[PDB]
Amino acid sequence: HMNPIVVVHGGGAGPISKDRKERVHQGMVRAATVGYGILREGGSAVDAVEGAVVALEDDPEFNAGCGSVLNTNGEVEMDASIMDGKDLSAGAVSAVQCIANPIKLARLVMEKTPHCFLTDQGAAQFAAAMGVPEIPGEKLVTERNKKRLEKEKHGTVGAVALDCKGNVAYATSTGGIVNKMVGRVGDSPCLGAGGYADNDIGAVSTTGHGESILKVNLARLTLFHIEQGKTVEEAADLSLGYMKSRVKGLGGLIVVSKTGDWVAKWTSTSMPWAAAKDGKLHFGIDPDDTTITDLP
């Protein structure tokens, strides 16, 4: 049976301040750690990635759940999806409000409906039906996000895993881009763009410019090259380069093959990432500055 793996990412975007980096490092650590714990206790790939993403949702340092960037009217509107590599079963929500964990709502879409994707009003009704708390909107909104919205007027997080039965899955969640139009949905809830997971290939979650990732189908394009026998680093580079060269888009991705190989590559300035395997934890943000600590 397979040695499990989890890989996590935050936003594939521009440079990050030094104080942030420390808060960021700990966040990538907490979610990688949380996800791997699940796998080391016999849990599924879906459990793991759901677990890591929740961690980043609950962490105000990340553009997902509490800490989501603001729309053009200063409200949080969140998108997410999750996908089971075994039968390709999937769950998604877009433009959901007043909840803590869009990724869990996403998981409920998959497991407790015959659908794959709900939006806005219906998503909110379904939440209520599932006994998902409704939190005051102001709780998701941070003071620092306000300064982004007030200023801008005048990145997506996620996870992939390979589990101890050799199954794969991705989860992704975002608040989107600062000053987005109300009801702007990006790449996250859109299968093949914000992520893709198939047991016959591997799994991918993307991040960066939502519209660009959508236009080129970045997650599934990444896996196609793996289908043709490109290596994981070979495929991520080709796929990302094509978003750059065709639609002028930048961003990042992480991947795990069904054989255990993994990578994190980004054409954006930075992308916080972490990978746990063989009892060790890998972490970074900027190119060629990784650390590798022991995960007891």
Which positions touch a copy of itself (CB under 8 A)? Answer: 77, 87-90, 92, 94-95, 113-126, 180-186, 189-193, 196, 211, 214-217, 220-221, 224, 246-247
Q: Which of left, alpha, beta for 208 (phi over 0: left; psi -120 to 50: alpha)?
A: left
User: Cα dihedral angle (269, 18, 152, 240), rounded to 10 degrees?
Assistant: 20
Is 198 a binding residue for Na ion by CB under 5 A? The answer is no
Q: Look up 156 and say whether it is catalytic.
A: yes
Based on the shown chain and the rule CB under 5 A, indicate whether residue 2 belongs to the binding site for Cl ion: yes
Catalytic: which of 156, 172, 174, 206? 156
* Residue 278 C-beta: closest distance to Na ion, Å: 26
Residues within window 62-121 making contact with Na ion, judged by CB under 5 A: 62, 64-67, 89, 110, 113
Instruction: Choose from a copy of itself, Cl ion, Na ion, none: what does 181 bind? Cβ within 5-8 Å by kind.
Output: a copy of itself
Task: Yes or no: say if 274 and 280 are a contact pair by the CB < 8 Å rule.
Answer: no
Complex with a copy of itself: residue 120 or 286, whichever CB lies closer = 120
Q: Counting contacts by CB under 5 A, is residue 166 touching Cl ion?
A: no
Q: Residue 164, interface with Cl ion (CB under 5 A)?
A: no
Strand partners of residue 92: 81, 117
Q: Compute the residue count for the chain.
A: 296
260 binding Cl ion? (CB under 5 A): yes
Is 206 assigned a ligand-binding role in the annotation?
A: no
For tokens 């996250």, what's the residue? 188
Q: Which is nearer to a copy of itself, 27 or 208 (CB)?
A: 208
Which residues make Cβ contacts (< 8 Å) with residue 226, sequence separation at least 6? 201, 202, 232, 235, 255, 257
Is 208 annotated among the ligand-binding residues? yes
Q: Do 17 and 172 meet the contact criterion of CB atoms below 8 Å apart?
A: no
3 binds Cl ion (CB under 5 A): yes
Minimum CB distance to Cl ion, residue 290 (Å) = 21
Rounded to 10 degrees, the C-alpha dihedral 122/158/181/215 comes to: -100
Residues 6+ apart with CB under 8 A from 186: 79, 156, 174, 176, 177, 194, 210, 211, 213, 214
Q: Which partner from the list a copy of itself, Cl ion, Na ion, none does 3 bind, CB cut-off 5 to 8 Å by kind?
A: Cl ion
Q: Which span (1-9, 78-86, 92-100, 187-195) binds Cl ion, by CB under 5 A?
A: 1-9
Element (H, E) at 221: helix 218-227
Which single residue is written with the structure tokens 């970045």?
218
Residues making up the annotated binding site are 184-187, 207-210
Indicate which residues carry an active-site annotation: 156
Residues making up the annotated binding site for substrate are 184-187, 207-210
Residues lying near Na ion in the complex (CB under 5 A) are found at: 10-11, 57, 59, 62, 64-67, 89, 110, 113, 272
